[PDB]
Design a protein around this ligand. Structure first.
Ligand code: MG
Ligand code: MG
Ligand code: MG
Ligand code: MG
Ligand code: MG
Ligand code: MG
Ligand code: MG
Ligand code: MG
Ligand code: MG
Ligand code: MG
Ligand code: MG
Ligand code: MG
Ligand code: MG
Ligand code: MG
Ligand code: MG
Ligand code: MG
Ligand code: MG
Lengths: 290, 25, 110
RNA sequence: UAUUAUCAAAUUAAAUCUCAUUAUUAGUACGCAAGGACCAUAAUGAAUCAACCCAUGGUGUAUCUAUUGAUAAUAAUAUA
RNA sequence: AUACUAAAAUUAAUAAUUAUAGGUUUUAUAUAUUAUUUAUAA
RNA sequence: UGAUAAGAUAAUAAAUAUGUGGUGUAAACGUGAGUAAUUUUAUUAGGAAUUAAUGAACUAUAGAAUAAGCUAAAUACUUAAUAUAUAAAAAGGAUAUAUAAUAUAUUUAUCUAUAGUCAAGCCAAUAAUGGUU
RNA sequence: ACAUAUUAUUAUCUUAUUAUUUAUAUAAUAUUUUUUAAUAAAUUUAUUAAUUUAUAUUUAUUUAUAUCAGAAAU
């Protein structure tokens, strides 16, 4: 019983609870109604068998998703099709669509890119569901820092370790990425450096519209030596650390920038317990691809 | 039960009216 | 089953409960029986105890005595608990009165 | 065939001893056909008998509960 | 075990061991209320 | 269009009436078992209790097309705002104007009010076979 | 002497269904709402148990009254 497995069970029970009929919920999830359920003896989908009792259901925590995302196996529908099955729900239901937070996109991206190895499936899935989210009145999930910046992170990851020289395709892909972005919150993280790096790598001149020249001011990580507080402080800033690590690894013009490297060093000070996830993913991707 | 009750009431009214008619005559 | 009839158990079977007896399909070809517990008969030996149940099917009245520890029955399910109207351990006297069981399966399915 | 405790043979006096149906042999043998077996076995019963009470049914002046009428008693306070 | 008989069990209180009947204590049976009901502890 | 064979968007051309939903069986057809008139039929230049907020479904005008839910989704169902003092109601399907979902027209649908039309409920008088064994 | 049917009636037996009654509910779902244990993030108001709480609720109905059908009777 792995942590990812128990998280999968929790979220599966959550989605089953929300997908079950409203009039039936009292007789599936309220122990006070067990005898009434026994008496009235409803049938299952396609009348398989009598309804089974279940315990109450409470809200679902956010970490249950990224936990399995990182602790996934090389390949399985369990996570490959989770996004499709989760989004295959009526926009009317509110919990299923409001659980998704902007900080989960860069979580799902890593597992597909490195461990699962089928990142094309996830990138394909993130097209027809944009308008569905728009109807579901949760358009803020696809933001800039967690979605646009992470998208260019994955794009540069593709271009590195593999041969890429198509300037026209790079330009078109940048434009469609800007199209996919539908929540304009420009924060410390700046994708100007990334677009310049891709432009000089593939021969194409950076071109966009509506972008802001926000300076990078990642919150410096202090010298805390606490426990839960330390790990939570690291957790809430994991992603931008990976951004800075990719920038240092790739961009040779990074010398003029100083916030990235100092923030990286402070994050490593906080991370002294474990190794660097950026090179962890590099190793995983290399060994899986080779 | 109730049928017998209302039947007895009806006969009571019948005989009372008969007695009234006889007394008047 | 011992806990089902345990005198030290508040939620035990009492005369008045309507129960369903389920038979094991691998060991016999019997059908479940819905009946009104007329009596719980316990003896010196624990294994040798029985339920006396009654049911008026259509307009024929049947009563069935089952050994509660016969290996041919898997479990017995309580369909509806007893009411406090009756005032004895063994409700033999309901036979033929307005207290009688009637068509239990039809009532339940109603 | 000269004790006692125990186990006991041959004998003697009795009890018992049974009878239907069904099935296979075999629709065979026998028969123009209709019908249709002896020789054997097995199963279910009948009738009689012997024992037993785990269970079921009866009883159950053991016992417990409800109730009608009359009467009497103990305990509480109250009064003397 | 039994009409009385006859048969069978026990008559222990011990420098070493035995339960016959009643009473007593447990575990059950019956009776019919029963968590509200139990005495409890904490 | 995922720099790879994944899932979507939009269009042209098609499939499904074994999934939800609407309309149609209060008619027509057949029959005469009942039924003798306190509850039926026929007839009045008949009556009021001075007859539903009755439209059933086409005309003639006016107006109106909205919010939440539940269903997979709706022109499915439920609760809610007005609009001739009443707690009085609904619906969307096919262009062209607009994105690096609506505003307007044409089309058929939906709802309410006032009349018309077709239609409804209940009464009176007279009549309706034989047996008084 | 007597026999067998058919129909109809009630001051009479049970009696499916429904209809009117009365009547208590962790109430059965909620609403409602004292509310109370929590949820759960990057630091939330159903969601269960229960606890509202009179609103409807239901099936028990708690008590009766009508009623298809069939019993005896005339
Ligand atoms: Mg001998
Ligand atoms: Mg002989
Ligand atoms: Mg012999
Ligand atoms: Mg003999
Ligand atoms: Mg016996
Ligand atoms: Mg005995
Ligand atoms: Mg007995
Ligand atoms: Mg006995
Ligand atoms: Mg002595
Ligand atoms: Mg003894
Ligand atoms: Mg003794
Ligand atoms: Mg001793
Ligand atoms: Mg259809
Ligand atoms: Mg007709
Ligand atoms: Mg005609
Ligand atoms: Mg509308
Ligand atoms: Mg409608």
């Amino acid at each position: 019983a792995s942590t990812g497995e128990i998280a999968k069970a929790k979220l599966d029970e959550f989605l089953i609870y929300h997908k079950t009929d409203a009039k039936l919920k009292p007789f599936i999830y309220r122990p006070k109604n067990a005898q009434i359920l026994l008496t009235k003896d409803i049938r299952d989908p396609k009348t398989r068998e009598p309804l089974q009792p279940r315990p109450p259901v409470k809200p679902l925590s956010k970490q249950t998703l990224n936990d399995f995302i990182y602790s996934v196996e090389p390949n399985s529908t369990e996570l490959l099709d989770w996004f499709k099955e989760w989004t295959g729900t009526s926009i009317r239901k509110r919990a299923i669509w409001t659980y998704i937070s902007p900080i989960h996109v860069q979580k799902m991206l890593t597992a597909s890119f490195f461990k699962i190895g089928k990142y094309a499936h996830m990138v394909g899935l993130l097209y027809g569901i944009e308008h569905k989210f728009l109807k579901a009145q949760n358009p803020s999930v696809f933001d800039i820092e967690h979605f646009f910046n992470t998208n260019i992170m994955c794009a540069l990851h593709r271009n590195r370790l593999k041969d890429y020289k198509d300037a026209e395709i790079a330009q078109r892909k940048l434009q469609v990425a800007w199209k996919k972005v539908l929540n304009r919150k420009n924060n410390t993280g700046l994708a100007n450096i990334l677009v310049a790096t891709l432009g000089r790598q593939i021969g194409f001149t950076p071109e966009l519209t509506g972008l802001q020249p926000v300076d990078i001011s990642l919150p410096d990580i202090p010298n805390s030596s606490s426990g839960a507080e330390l790990k939570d402080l690291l957790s809430k800033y994991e992603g931008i650390y990976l951004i800075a690590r990719t920038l240092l690894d790739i961009d040779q013009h990074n010398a003029q920038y100083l916030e990235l490297q100092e923030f990286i060093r402070q994050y490593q000070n906080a991370l002294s317990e474990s190794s660097d996830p950026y090179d962890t993913h590099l190793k995983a991707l290399g060994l899986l691809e080779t | 039960s109730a049928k017998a009750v209302k039947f007895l009431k009806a006969q009571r009214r019948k005989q009372k009216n008969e007695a009234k008619q006889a007394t008047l005559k | 089953k011992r806990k089902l009839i345990s005198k030290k158990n508040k939620d035990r079977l009492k005369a008045g409960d309507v129960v369903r007896i389920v038979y094991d399909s691998s060991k016999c070809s019997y059908d479940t029986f819905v009946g009104y517990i007329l009596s719980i008969d316990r003896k010196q030996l624990v294994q040798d105890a029985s339920l006396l149940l009654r049911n008026q099917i259509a307009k024929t009245a049947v009563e069935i005595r089952v050994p509660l520890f016969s290996p041919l029955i898997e479990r017995i399910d309580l369909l509806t608990p007893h009411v406090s109207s009756r005032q004895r351990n063994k409700h033999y006297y309901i036979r033929g009165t307005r207290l009688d069981v009637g068509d239990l399966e039809a009532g339940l399915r109603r």
